[model samples]
Target: IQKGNFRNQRKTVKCFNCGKEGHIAKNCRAPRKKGCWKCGKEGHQMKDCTERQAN
Candidate 1:
């Protein structure tokens, strides 16, 4: 199994290749984040992304 990066503390840095966060895209568990397709911002997970949607 892969090991966690002790130097990397930011869990928001999720991999687009995998839906899992806290690691780089190469070590992702999946092949894409659900709502991160359109923008750099995580569009899904409203609880996480609490900013208001653009008009």
Candidate 2:
């Protein structure tokens, strides 16, 4: 095996909800507990996130 060129390779993230690659769990459409983008808490979205206000 050869070392991959990190810059040339297109990395795809897997979604936690559907276990699918290409995007992160945050963009997953599967019905799963949404997590906060700020604190990474389950069952919430970035728009409804409250952690930012505290900071």
Candidate 3:
């Protein structure tokens, strides 16, 4: 298991990869946050990127 892990503060830094509350994974991939990213899995951009389409 990956032990001695850091960045475990209950602050504002959220995980851009998984968003577990307080984390900032530099190697971010997931798009669960529209505040920082606009292209999430679905239903993300509303008044921003128009990332939605009809199909």
Candidate 4:
């Protein structure tokens, strides 16, 4: 990765949680994070989820 370029003309750095410059996906610091839709749990999505919802 390029360093100290400030603004790259060809490459673009961004975060998966929140699309922003200067930081990569591993360094994301967004206030609110996405949660699982299946069980309404945090830190993961439906596919990765293992816990079942109570009936």
How high is each candidate's TM-score? 0.26, 0.34, 0.27, 0.36
User: Residue pairs in steric clash, candidate 2?
Assistant: 34-43
**Candidate topping lDDT:** 4
State each candidate's clash count. Answer: 1, 1, 0, 0
In angstroms, give how far residue 55 of model 3 lies from its true place: 15
The residue-level lDDT of candidate 2 at 24 comes to: 58
| Per-residue lDDT of candidate 3, residues 1-55 (tens digit) | 2212433443344554575654455656555453433234544442465545778
Off by over 4 Å in 1: 1-11, 29-55
* Best-to-worst ranking by TM-score: 4, 2, 3, 1
Best by TM-score: 4
Tens-digit lDDT string for candidate 1 (1-55): 2223432344355544444557766565554555643245554742465456766
The best-first sequence of candidates by lDDT reads 4, 2, 1, 3
Regions of candidate 2 where Cα sits further than 4 Å from its true position: 1-10, 33-55
Q: Write the per-residue lDDT of candidate 4 for residues 1-55, one digit (tens) a residue.
A: 5433434223766443455677754576776457853355688855687766676
**Alpha carbon lDDT at 43, candidate 3:** 45
lDDT of each: 0.49, 0.53, 0.47, 0.56
Which 10-residue window of candidate 1 scores lowest in summed lDDT? 1-10
**What's the C-alpha lDDT at position 28 in model 4?**
64
**Model 4, residue 34: displacement in angstroms?**
3.6
